[PDB]
Design a protein around this ligand. Sequence first.
Ligand SMILES: Cc1cc2nc3c(=O)[nH]c(=O)nc-3n(C[C@H](O)[C@H](O)[C@H](O)COP(=O)(O)OP(=O)(O)OC[C@H]3O[C@@H](n4cnc5c(N)ncnc54)[C@H](O)[C@@H]3O)c2cc1C
Ligand SMILES: Cc1cc2nc3c(=O)[nH]c(=O)nc-3n(C[C@H](O)[C@H](O)[C@H](O)COP(=O)(O)OP(=O)(O)OC[C@H]3O[C@@H](n4cnc5c(N)ncnc54)[C@H](O)[C@@H]3O)c2cc1C
Ligand SMILES: Nc1ncnc2c1ncn2[C@@H]1O[C@H](COP(=O)(O)OP(=O)(O)O)[C@@H](O)[C@H]1O
Ligand SMILES: Nc1ncnc2c1ncn2[C@@H]1O[C@H](COP(=O)(O)OP(=O)(O)O)[C@@H](O)[C@H]1O
Lengths: 401, 401
Amino acid sequence: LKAPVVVLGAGLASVSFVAELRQAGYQGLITVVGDEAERPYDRPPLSKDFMAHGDAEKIRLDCKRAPEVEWLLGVTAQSFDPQAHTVALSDGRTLPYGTLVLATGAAPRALPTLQGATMPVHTLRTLEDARRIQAGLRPQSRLLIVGGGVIGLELAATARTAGVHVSLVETQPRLMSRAAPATLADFVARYHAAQGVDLRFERSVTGSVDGVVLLDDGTRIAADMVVVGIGVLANDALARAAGLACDDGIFVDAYGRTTCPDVYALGDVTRQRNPLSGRFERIETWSNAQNQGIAVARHLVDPTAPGYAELPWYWSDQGALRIQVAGLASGDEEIVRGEVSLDAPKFTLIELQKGRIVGATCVNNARDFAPLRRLLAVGAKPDRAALADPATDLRKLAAAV
Amino acid sequence: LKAPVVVLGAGLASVSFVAELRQAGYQGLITVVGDEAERPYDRPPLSKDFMAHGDAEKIRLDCKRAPEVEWLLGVTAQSFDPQAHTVALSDGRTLPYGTLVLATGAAPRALPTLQGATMPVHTLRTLEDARRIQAGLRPQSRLLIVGGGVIGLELAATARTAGVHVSLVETQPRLMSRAAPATLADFVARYHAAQGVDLRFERSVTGSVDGVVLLDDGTRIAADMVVVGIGVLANDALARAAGLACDDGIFVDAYGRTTCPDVYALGDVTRQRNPLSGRFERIETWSNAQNQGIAVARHLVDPTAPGYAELPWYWSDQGALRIQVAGLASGDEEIVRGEVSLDAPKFTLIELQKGRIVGATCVNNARDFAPLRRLLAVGAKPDRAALADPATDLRKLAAAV
Ligand SMILES: Cc1cc2nc3c(=O)[nH]c(=O)nc-3n(C[C@H](O)[C@H](O)[C@H](O)COP(=O)(O)OP(=O)(O)OC[C@H]3O[C@@H](n4cnc5c(N)ncnc54)[C@H](O)[C@@H]3O)c2cc1C
Ligand SMILES: Cc1cc2nc3c(=O)[nH]c(=O)nc-3n(C[C@H](O)[C@H](O)[C@H](O)COP(=O)(O)OP(=O)(O)OC[C@H]3O[C@@H](n4cnc5c(N)ncnc54)[C@H](O)[C@@H]3O)c2cc1C
Ligand SMILES: Nc1ncnc2c1ncn2[C@@H]1O[C@H](COP(=O)(O)OP(=O)(O)O)[C@@H](O)[C@H]1O
Ligand SMILES: Nc1ncnc2c1ncn2[C@@H]1O[C@H](COP(=O)(O)OP(=O)(O)O)[C@@H](O)[C@H]1O
């Protein structure tokens, strides 16, 4: 840790990091460069209550645990020179750094086949995006969503609640192929279908003409608005240009170090080790942005601190479904706790590998999720019959281990 | 570049690197730690003329362009401490370093289903391995090779020349799936089949009993010896333990930097950017080991030098086939120069993407390969009709661009 500290990006990873630097006792300069002209804010509300209530003053991040930080909002870092230890800003200024931290997140992938579209086609990442989409959620209008990932499905649920007709096109045979157990994905499809979402599996968009979207089965979907949610791409351009190791994401170790001395990276922009799979992955979650930012800050201030070690997890709020998912989507065994039913949905899935818990899912069962994450963290090997048995208390099991 | 320099591994990447350090003018200490008790040697001969002639004194690497290097042969680096800047050796000594270079290569993957085998099962990476295999190439004996990659096929050709009966089991529908155009792989299969190799595609080994290997189609192959060639795994254990970013290979940028300050990596142990695909890959070639070692050395001595920028290529010698392959195995177009025939095989393949050359293959046509590599390097977009036309001189084309 060399002063001054400069962070590029003012999202959750950046805020979490700078707050932890302060809390851990670093008293040198901190400057944060954020391209959005917005008081730092959290993204999960954008496809949830914000999309429904529209009050941005409910979604701001708490920067009060980060005193004495200059936030340069509405400014873009254009490049950095890792020899000179400087960053070039879009407003013509240059910042010196001792330690540079790249927390620039990721951007929605565009759909090449809609590039020349003459109808509204949006993606959903920013507050500006959310406002633009919400303005078009007219009751009885038709929305097409491209992509059956969590954000697309959260938008689908939000739009149906708003009285919007929703169609959704997914290239895979299932929803949430990226990070969800098949049992969960099958149920989620049944839920959205029951709520009036017109789901099209194993279809892709081939183009569009005069307000109608074309599919690869040679058919058509008329829509008033298209929202594309086919994944994201790391915002790693400054890193690539500066000669850091990148591949749709900046490679970092558990200390957040890039291949360039004195340059670190955090959050959605990073490709990092998933301790459960033992492979490098881009981990695109709120918990990662916060926890990785905190861990990297802590170890910079106190080199005796361990590197980042948290196991992955996320949640999704889709209408009546409060979904929580931790760890790996599959192993060699799944245990189902509760009935999987559209009538008052409430269940837990547990994924095992050779008897060891490697993942878990809770649907409308938050009480079970914390204990399961603890069992997951220690690689617990509980009695499978006990894990299945409804009479088993999971909190006690986690306390006993 | 801080003295002293310590390199872990004494293969081609290490020798190439240390020779370049000297040639570029670095005069400080260089110490190389090599676990094999062997004068540094090249591996390609092991499945080629060595396997046939057995003279190791024809396969040694030239270390004369690396004066004043202490080579600690037959010694294993057990760990390094990147804070203390030391390396712990198996002989009880410790080496200090200013700059540490990890050039530890890769090891053959074992076949889990043969782990408890009670018949000879070998892999082919080292001189010791080659001697052990050669000792068992008894004429009229039966060899089973597991894996239809280049080393397995070179061994197949060598064994057939020696009068050994050869069967080969490949999980994929084709040979050389890793880095060869399908047109080449189809031809190579026809060649080996015509030479008496018993090829089994879309088969896997499930186990073995009393000198017989079992397959997943429920059948059997009797053999006197099994050689497993199912790929390699990076020797990145010291890097993983020391906290560097690794995933079956140490991530490096174009300067050879790892995520740990003052630690570099080179050759088979690295995962690095392929400029043609724009993705990170482990590049398992002789040309990479040499060229990456040279580039990393050059830039350490002269920071104004560019990073590593060479495009990938390899060769394989399989009986009557002298195969050369550069760049990508496929694009959106292949152009075939010459007839593809078992009668005096001689042809060239050119892979294009939107008219730009992205790969090339020469079979028994070395004269064409150099010009094609030059056209590939500049991303030439030659006239496709000219590229096909047998009347076209490729050397002139490369000279004109
Ligand atoms: C609609 C939506 C819903 C989500 N829901 C959930 C959820 O329910 N659960 C969950 O686990 N995760 C959810 N996520 C994911 C979560 O919000 C992200 O993982 C988190 O935002 C990543 O934070 P970050 O700081 O790494 O990146 P970001 O939040 O993207 O912040 C990076 C910032 O850097 C800025 N930037 C980029 N380049 C530059 C530059 N050159 N100069 C200056 N600034 C730059 C970007 O514009 C951005 O403002 C959701 C995300 C979205 C978009
Ligand atoms: C049989 C065979 C045939 C091949 N044919 C061709 C060919 O025709 N064309 C082509 O392009 N490529 C070919 N190759 C590939 C090429 O030889 C490799 O790409 C090259 O050997 C990689 O060199 P390297 O220095 O990175 O690694 P290596 O050659 O593996 O050297 C690394 C050295 O480090 C040692 N080491 C590992 N860990 C430690 C430690 N902790 N302490 C000390 N030493 C350690 C290893 O034992 C090894 O001696 C062939 C390889 C083999 C095995
Ligand atoms: N071209 C495409 N058309 C339709 N669906 C796609 C396409 N590419 C990817 N998908 C699907 O879109 C979904 C994206 O999900 P996810 O990765 O969670 O991203 P997002 O954050 O945008 O929801 C996945 O289920 C994936 O299979
Ligand atoms: N379990 C397996 N059984 C049989 N063949 C395999 C298995 N795993 C991989 N292979 C095949 O083995 C070949 C290995 O080729 P390559 O990657 O060049 O490695 P090598 O250097 O050992 O030849 C590939 O064609 C691959 O499809």
